[model samples]
Target: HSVKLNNNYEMPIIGLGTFRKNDAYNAVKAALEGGYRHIDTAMIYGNEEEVGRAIKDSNIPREEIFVTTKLWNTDQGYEKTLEAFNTSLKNLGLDYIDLYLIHWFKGYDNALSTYRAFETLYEEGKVKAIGVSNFNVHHLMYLMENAKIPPMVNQVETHVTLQNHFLHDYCKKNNIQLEAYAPLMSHQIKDLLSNETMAKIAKKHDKTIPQIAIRWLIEREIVVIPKSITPERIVQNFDVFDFTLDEEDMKSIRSVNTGKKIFTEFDNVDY
Candidate 1:
């Protein structure tokens, strides 16, 4: 299933997150073969070329896949943003990006300039949609006030533990789709995957804990990208469509929210 962005573009709700995956080519190939039409990558990920090549070799029509990539922190200026976008396009070997996002909110001055470049790309049709990543409500409020075109999506670290309810609500109110990265908590926090509540829900649904986690986000209408390089896991992650979580199941999952964020390194860095 897909969600309509503010610009009315359809984006697949479930996608493959290629953050630290060492074998992006095989992972992407496996995902595409497993029925995942959305693939998320970034310039700093250092695997855009592999992702591009895999998509090219998949023999799937380019338009059928929704490809998203981001600009790095160093490339946040107006001129550098344009240059970085071109570099990302070259790396991905794509004529146009389905979604292009500012990787992070730097500073107001830098963001203002960077968003201008984003506007230019959108106007020129180089990017189908433009948005921001790792932005909090304040950052978004500031950008919305200054930008000619508001952001369509805010990709952030979201999971049962870090539900990001306030930001999610804000994005919802603004018609900005909230995309979840590390949706499965990158499997770094074992407690989350092994939680009794999640385990019980998984048992009831006959699905794995990860699937339950992904489904919770899907149930909330939040776009989720669960990263996995293993073929079996990649297929398993995308197999969440058939099951629907009931209201009780949804509340049970909601009770797991710890109000904690894993990627806290970017919390203080504004630039």
Candidate 2:
């Protein structure tokens, strides 16, 4: 399934999030063959070239797949953002990027400038959409007030434990489609896939725990990108379209929310 962005572009609900230098290419290749069309990467991930090569080598046409890469935190200024985009373009070897996001809300001043550069890219038809990642309600509000083009997507950490209801609602109200990055909690937090509720739901639908997580996010109209290096798991993640979770199941899963985050990337950068 796909969600229609405010810009009218359809993004696949499930995507492949690239990993460090060595893992991205194979994961992307496996994901493509497994029927994933959306692939997410970042300048900091340091695998844009591999991602490009994988996409180029795949039988899938470029327009058929949606590719997203972010502007790194250090590349936040208006001028630097523009230059970084060109570098990413060259690295990816793609004619145009499907979606370009500001990686974070760091250095608020530079963040705004970077988004303006994104706006320019949008108008120039270099990117199908422009967005941000790790931006909270206030960050989005500030950007919306200042930007000529509001963000089309906001990628953030969202799993069963950290549902981020407040931010989700705000993004929904403002027409910004929320895209989940650590939908499986980076697969490091065992409880995300081992939670009893998820396990029950998985059995109830005859799906794996991760499938339960991805489907739950999709049911709420949120986009999810779950990553994995194992080919079987990569293919398994895309099998969510075969089942639907009932209301009772949904309620049971919602009760598992701990209102806590597992991935601690930054401590001082306030939303």
Candidate 3:
């Protein structure tokens, strides 16, 4: 049900990804009510307040939920990272965040400086965990080589089309938890959900195509965050725990991988 981070924190395997969803408040509320204990948001998402309010109104104990927010690109420096974190904390109306991450890898100097502030916050007990997002093997290696503490997690764009096998294995080898952001392949959702392989698996398991896709990721031990604003879909996404994919199903899912990535604007940007 949960994966242990490098720092020994228990993070739910599945979480609600509130990226571009307009109804974050309702979506988060529905997710919490429907049994999702993890919620992922970002400062640039512009809905942290709504997400915080939804969590607050859910009446679920604060400690029971895992909240993850990120520091945006423009706020990548040390002083700004600290300021951004406080703003995010105030926006969420929470005393501490379960996890805070660098939204993207800007530059080595900036990342090191930003992570320095992250270490400060971690020592101050403001964040239970700290990590990075959209980081590739080189980016992670650079950070690991320079920083005092290696990243505990790396959130990236992964889906049936882009399984990210190499990065997944690298993260695994280093004890860093690899999290999939667009587990359904954002924009290309139709293509993925309509895949014949996923369709067959869904029918065999009596689950939806989305569930099949998410289950495939779960079978690999990768954390997945699927975004949705619709209440019914939100609840359906979290219904993957009732079944397990056998080796045959896993092999079929693997054949669907094309090594294609949807979000690549930041992929080649080292500076």
lDDT of 1 by residue, 1-271 (tens): 9899989999999999896544989999999999999999999999998899989887999999999999999999999999999999999999799999988878889888999999999999999999999988888998888888989999999999889888899999998999999988875658777799999999999999999999999999999999888889999999999989999998888889887778854448645
Cα lDDT of all candidates, in order?
0.90, 0.87, 0.92
Q: Per-residue lDDT for 21-117 in model 2, tens only?
A: 5577889988898899999998888999999999977789899999999998877888999999999999999879999998887866877889989
Candidate 3 on 1-271: residue-level lDDT in tens? 9999988999999999996544888899999999999999999999998899999886999999999999999999999999999999999999899999999988889889999999999999999999999999988999889998779999999888999899999999988999999998888999997799999999999999999999889999999999998899999999999999999999999989997778865567543
Question: What TM-score against the true fold does each predicted structure earn?
Answer: 0.97, 0.96, 0.97
User: What residue runs in model 3 are displaced by over 4 Å at the alpha carbon?
Assistant: 269-271
lDDT of 3: 0.92
Candidate 1 vs candidate 3, lDDT winner: 3
